[PDB]
């Protein structure tokens, strides 16, 4: 059924970054509703990427879209504004989760 991913690696749940988007008007607006977005991110292992600019843009498609292909049948959907807010956060979350593993792949004693 849900043949979009195939079987990507699902990251840990996190607290989300709050973000301004455009200002502290939207910051609270986002936090008031933020439950509809993911707590984690979908991507492959870091062992199967080359640069964040391709990782994150994919991660930001895939995670959103796997949230979409769950809510889309409910009568929920997302507005293009909610896709915008989601992709905003999900970009940061992708970058956060990868950064964990990116340094875990290495971790010489980076200072």
Curated annotation (Swiss-Prot):
As for subcellular location, the record says:
Cell membrane; Golgi apparatus
Q: Which positions anchor the lipid (GPI-anchor amidated alanine)? A: 110
**Sugar-modified residues:** 61, 77
Cystine connections? 59-94
Protein family (similarity comment): Belongs to the prion family.
Related illness = PrP is found in high quaPntity in the brain of humans and animals infected with the degenerative neurological diseases kuru, Creutzfeldt-Jakob disease (CJD), Gerstmann-Straussler syndrome (GSS), scrapie, bovine spongiform encephalopathy (BSE), transmissible mink encephalopathy (TME), etc.
Record note on quaternary structure = Monomer and homodimer. Has a tendency to aggregate into amyloid fibrils containing a cross-beta spine, formed by a steric zipper of superposed beta-strands. Soluble oligomers may represent an intermediate stage on the path to fibril formation. Copper binding may promote oligomerization. Interacts with GRB2, APP, ERI3/PRNPIP and SYN1. Mislocalized cytosolically exposed PrP interacts with MGRN1; this interaction alters MGRN1 subcellular location and causes lysosomal enlargement. Interacts with KIAA1191.
Function text: Its primary physiological function is unclear. Has cytoprotective activity against internal or environmental stresses. May play a role in neuronal development and synaptic plasticity. May be required for neuronal myelin sheath maintenance. May play a role in iron uptake and iron homeostasis. Soluble oligomers are toxic to cultured neuroblastoma cells and induce apoptosis (in vitro). Association with GPC1 (via its heparan sulfate chains) targets PRNP to lipid rafts. Also provides Cu(2+) or Zn(2+) for the ascorbate-mediated GPC1 deaminase degradation of its heparan sulfate side chains.
Domain notes per entry: The normal, monomeric form has a mainly alpha-helical structure. The disease-associated, protease-resistant form forms amyloid fibrils containing a cross-beta spine, formed by a steric zipper of superposed beta-strands. Disease mutations may favor intermolecular contacts via short beta strands, and may thereby trigger oligomerization.
Q: What is this protein called?
A: Major prion protein
| Species | Cervus elaphus nelsoni
Gene name, Swiss-Prot/TrEMBL: PRNP
* Residue numbers of the full-length protein present here: 124 to 234 of 256
